[PDB]
């Protein structure tokens, strides 16, 4: 257990100033903040904690207000005395998920600098799939120590206490242990992160500098029109009713639009072929095949989709508007994906349909404030360009070199015919192949996405590998080093460990081979996107133009730019993105503007 003897609870200026003095000469120090809410923009700082050495840490309570709470240094006094240390780029800080802490200090006009080590990221860069990268998991993995959980001091359920209600000493045990343990994790991981210049590089120049930019992006938020969202909601209830009637009208009686229950008893009972279609799914969708001539399945198809979309974005989004800012603040996760791409939640921007008409309507609800315009900067098929370089293929490289459409160029060579005469079905085949390679798709999986028979798909892949030889070389060379060293790397050094590469199990090992081919191209794009964010954010902080970086989804960065500035700013973002990142991959940035995200997209 941790008692009230481990750490000190600072309740007077004389002691705080003493610690501040020690802090100023420590090589590095761990620091943490305690608040009354998980909501960064509207949380209140309840206290701060530090650790200058393993086992030597303190907690400074500034805003606990339960009945009869003892005197504490005022939040304002503590922050003014602590400010210089925090705003000093030279004083290096350590912390677990420093993003959250940086934002909290920003609620008080304090710019946290010297953001050098985030143990959450150290862990992530060491091995992304090693396990969960949260402090509690880390401490158990690297220190065989079980930390005090939040539920332990605050409680569970609706009657859970906010930090400001917890007794000073109990708050101290939790807060000071955080800092202390954080420092210990650093000391154990930092040394390891240097055994290789690859991960080291990614961690230092990509991941760490990104911590404050993600904070600024998250806090800026995104302006959403709730009216638009409400109309769309009402309209979708009418379309759901209409679609249900049409289904009943096609056959007879009433029924749910649920497969393997009410659908099979209708669809195949009135001709077709027995099996159902899982909502496994992106490989054999029985329902959309019948949709080319059959009407009923086509309506049930479009019904489910609308039903999912409505309750996921149409009814949720408006409830996520923050009362303090009036904007929506999405949560980006830096240490979650195995390849290094940022993920997103509440809302998960990446699941909003792109090639679909309704997803477009959702995007229209993302609006620019008065006198501003939404500006969308996107990397045109970056992954494919990355594969081009990785395979050293003159064909692909030349296609991008002279600005031709790679999918048509691919079909022109694979099917052997002029580029101006390649048909829509041929381009669609090549595209299926091109993206099939990135995910390491099997010759039969391609047959299921193209609807052609097996070995007909094989015919195509053999023609591809012959016309584009370098792509097979890469596929094999990557599957090679993967088994040899148990991992694959990206252009910047980022690593994905594949433990099941020699699995001895069939499919488990196949997954590991697909990931081998994929990870290098996907992780490299991720790295590129992060370098663009840092680059654009640096210019933002230095030049102070009238623009905010509001979103990051897939291979694009979304901004809010002042209408009078649109042109000069567009020139700038474009240059920053296709020039201040890597100079070895042939990159292209498509920049567009509009009144809402859909208009600029
Ligand atoms: Mn914390
Ligand atoms: Zn804490």
Swiss-Prot record:
Tell me which domain of life the UniProt entry assigns to the organism this sequence originates from: Bacteria
Region Polymerase: list its residue ranges: 198-601
Q: What class of enzyme is it?
A: transferase
Protein EC: 2.7.7.7
What GO molecular function terms would the record report?
A: 3'-5' exonuclease activity; 5'-3' exonuclease activity; DNA binding; DNA-directed DNA polymerase activity
| Family from the record | Belongs to the DNA polymerase type-A family.
Kindly state the subunit structure of this protein: Single-chain monomer with multiple functions.
Name listed for the protein in its UniProt record: DNA polymerase I
Q: What is the lineage of its organism?
A: Bacteria, Pseudomonadati, Pseudomonadota, Gammaproteobacteria, Enterobacterales
| Protein encoded by which gene | polA
Q: Please tell me where this chain falls within the complete protein, as first and last residue plus total length.
A: 324 to 928 of 928
């Amino acid at each position: 257990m941790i008692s009230y003897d481990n750490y000190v609870t600072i309740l007077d200026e004389e002691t705080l100033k003493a610690w501040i003095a020690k802090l100023e000469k420590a090589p590095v120090f761990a620091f943490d903040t305690e608040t009354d809410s998980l909501d960064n923009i509207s949380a209140n700082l309840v206290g701060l904690s530090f650790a200058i050495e393993p086992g030597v840490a303190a907690y400074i309570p500034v805003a606990h207000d339960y009945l009869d709470a003892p005197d504490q240094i005022s939040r304002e006094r503590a922050l003014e005395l602590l400010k210089p240390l925090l705003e000093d780029e030279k004083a290096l800080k350590v912390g677990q998920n420093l993003k959250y802490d940086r934002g909290i200090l920003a609620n008080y006009g304090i710019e946290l600098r010297g953001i050098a080590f985030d143990t959450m990221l150290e862990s992530y860069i060491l091995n992304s799939v090693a396990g969960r990268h949260d402090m509690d998991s880390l401490a158990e993995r690297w220190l065989k120590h079980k930390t005090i959980t939040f539920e332990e001091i605050a409680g569970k359920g609706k009657n859970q206490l906010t930090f400001n209600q917890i007794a000073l000493e109990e708050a101290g045990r939790y807060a000071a242990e955080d800092a202390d343990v954080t420092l210990q994790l650093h000391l154990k991981m930092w040394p390891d992160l240097q055994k290789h210049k690859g991960p080291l590089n990614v961690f230092e120049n990509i991941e760490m500098p990104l911590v404050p930019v993600l904070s600024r992006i998250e806090r800026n938020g995104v302006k959403i029109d709730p009216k638009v969202l409400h109309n769309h909601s009402e309209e979708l209830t009418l379309r759901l009713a209409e679609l249900e009637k049409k289904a009943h009208e096609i056959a007879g009686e009433e029924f749910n639009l649920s497969s393997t229950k009410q659908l099979q008893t209708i669809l195949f009972e009135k001709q077709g072929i027995k099996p159902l279609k899982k909502t496994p799914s992106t490989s054999e969708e029985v329902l959309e095949e019948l949709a080319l001539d059959y009407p009923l399945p086509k309506v049930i198809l479009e019904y489910r989709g609308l039903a999912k979309l409505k309750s996921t974005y149409t009814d949720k989004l408006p409830l996520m508007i923050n009362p303090k800012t009036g904007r929506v603040h999405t949560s980006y996760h830096q240490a979650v994906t195995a390849t290094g791409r940022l993920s997103s939640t509440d809302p998960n921007l990446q699941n909003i349909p792109v090639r679909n008409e309704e997803g477009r309507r959702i995007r229209q609800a993302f609006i620019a404030p008065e006198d501003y315009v939404i500006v969308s900067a996107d990397y045109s098929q970056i992954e494919l360009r990355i594969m081009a370089h990785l395979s050293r293929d003159k064909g692909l490289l030349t296609a991008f070199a002279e600005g031709k459409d790679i999918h048509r160029a691919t079909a022109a060579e694979v099917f052997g015919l002029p580029l101006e005469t390649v048909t829509s079905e041929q381009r669609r085949s090549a595209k299926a192949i091109n993206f099939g390679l990135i995910y390491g798709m099997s010759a039969f999986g391609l047959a299921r996405q193209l609807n052609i028979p097996r070995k007909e798909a094989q015919k195509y892949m053999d023609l591809y590998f012959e016309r584009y030889p370098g792509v097979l070389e890469y596929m094999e060379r990557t599957r090679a080093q993967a088994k040899e060293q148990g991992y694959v790397e990206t252009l910047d050094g980022r690593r994905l460990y594949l433990p099941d590469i020699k699995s001895s199990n069939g499919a488990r090992r196949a997954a590991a081979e697909r990931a081998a081919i994929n990870a290098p191209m996907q992780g490299t794009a991720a790295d590129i996107i992060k370098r663009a964010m840092i680059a654009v954010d640096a210019w933002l902080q230095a030049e102070q133009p009238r623009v905010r970086m509001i979103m990051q989804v897939h291979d694009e960065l979304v901004f809010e730019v002042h209408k009078d500035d649109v042109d000069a700013v567009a020139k700038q973002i474009h240059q920053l993105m296709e020039n201040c990142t890597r100079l070895d991959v042939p990159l292209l940035v498509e920049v567009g503007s509009g009144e809402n995200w859909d208009q600029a997209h």
